[PDB]
Amino acid sequence: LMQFTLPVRLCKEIELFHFDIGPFENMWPGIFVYMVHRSCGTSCFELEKLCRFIMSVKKNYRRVPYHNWKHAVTVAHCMYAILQNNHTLFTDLERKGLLIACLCHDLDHRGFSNSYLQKFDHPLAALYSTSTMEQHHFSQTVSILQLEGHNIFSTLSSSEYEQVLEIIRKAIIATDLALYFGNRKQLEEMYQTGSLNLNNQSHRDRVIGLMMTACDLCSVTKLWPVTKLTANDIYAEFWAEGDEMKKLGIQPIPMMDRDKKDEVPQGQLGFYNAVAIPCYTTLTQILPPTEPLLKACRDNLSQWEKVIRGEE
Ligand SMILES: Cc1ncc(C)n2nc(/C=C/c3nc(-c4cn[nH]c4)nn3C)nc12
Numbered sequence: 001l002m003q004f005t006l007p008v009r010l011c012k013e014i015e016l017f018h019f020d021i022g023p024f025e026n027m028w029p030g031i032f033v034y035m036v037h038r039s040c041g042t043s044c045f046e047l048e049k050l051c052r053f054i055m056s057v058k059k060n061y062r063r064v065p066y067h068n069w070k071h072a073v074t075v076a077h078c079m080y081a082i083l084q085n086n087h088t089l090f091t092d093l094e095r096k097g098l099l100i101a102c103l104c105h106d107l108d109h110r111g112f113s114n115s116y117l118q119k120f121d122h123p124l125a126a127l128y129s130t131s132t133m134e135q136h137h138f139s140q141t142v143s144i145l146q147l148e149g150h151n152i153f154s155t156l157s158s159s160e161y162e163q164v165l166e167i168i169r170k171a172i173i174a175t176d177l178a179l180y181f182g183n184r185k186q187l188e189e190m191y192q193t194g195s196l197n198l199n200n201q202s203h204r205d206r207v208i209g210l211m212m213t214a215c216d217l218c219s220v221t222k223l224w225p226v227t228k229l230t231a232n233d234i235y236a237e238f239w240a241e242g243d244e245m246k247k248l249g250i251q252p253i254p255m256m257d258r259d260k261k262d263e264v265p266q267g268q269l270g271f272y273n274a275v276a277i278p279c280y281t282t283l284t285q286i287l288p289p290t291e292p293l294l295k296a297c298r299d300n301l302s303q304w305e306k307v308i309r310g311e312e
């Protein structure tokens with residue numbers, strides 16, 4: 001059969017957590033398929049269906065600065081790295097569902113937060129009162145799966161099909177950062193009282209939730225120049241939302257106010273300390289081989305400290 005292969009540098013580097021998928025948009029589908037093939041098997045999906053699914057997903061990401069098709073592939077690569085470093089811990093359905101979930105997790109994102117849609121009173125905020133964008137992302141995923149010739153899961157049974165869509169749904173909902181805090185606290189407690197048990201479905205669910213937050217936040221786990229340049233795209237969305245808040249007559253939070261550009265280094269610090277570090281710590285406790293994410297995150301915190309001290 002037809003095995004996708006990548007040039008030597010990418011073949012080697014794609015296995016590392018800190019891999020950057022590069023600026024050549026046209027290689028991103030092949031990179032993703034390569035990942036599916038190695039973490040799942042060349043047999044997981046009908047190549048033609050998979051190819052068709054990928055291109056529809058791509059077409060349904062928008063040309064926004066950060067929440068775009070490059071982000072989808074990036075988050076899916078992080079998941080690939082997690083799965084490859086924890087070979088025996090995941091079921092066949094999970095390996096299948098999770099890369100698709102990551103590719104799909106921000107489908108049709110407009111560059112605006114849940115909180116902005118609520119204040120704008122967007123129709124989606126009446127449809128989905130919490131995790132507004134995320135329930136939309138999963139809705140878009142099902143739509144795409146139901147297009148003619150796009151059903152990459154067609155060869156599973158009815159109940160395996162329902163299980164995989166259930167994995168994907170929960171994984172996608174989990175990318176709502178509002179839900180991460182309590183999820184990580186539960187996980188922390190279960191781990192430390194020794195009650196964490198991966199045969200309990202509701203525990204796996206939590207752990208897969210955490211992996212989703214880890215993959216989603218993985219720009220903070222890259223080489224410093226990648227992390228720093230990604231931060232620009234992130235803030236370009238934040239500030240556009242800030243402007244839109246001002247248009248509705250609402251002072252945005254500082255994160256989103258382009259007049260407070262100076263406080264960015266200090267805002268990154270708060271974020272690494274309140275969100276990122278806790279996230280990769282708990283993940284490393286649960287899944288030891290994901291430690292390089294924690295180590296990379298801490299290096300980047302240290303880089304933001306240097307920026308504040310004027311050394312950078
Ligand atoms: C790197 C990153 N990846 C994902 C996500 C959701 N985030 N969120 C942040 C936010 C940082 C931040 N910046 C300011 C601020 C700026 N100027 N003044 C204050 N506050 N905060 C909280 N940063 C990230």
Ligand SMILES: [Mg+2]
Pocket residue numbers: 105106133175176
């Ligand atoms: Mg999202």
Ligand SMILES: [Zn+2]
Pocket residue numbers: 067
């Ligand atoms: Zn996001």
Ligand SMILES: [Zn+2]
Pocket residue numbers: 071075105106175216
């Ligand atoms: Zn995302």
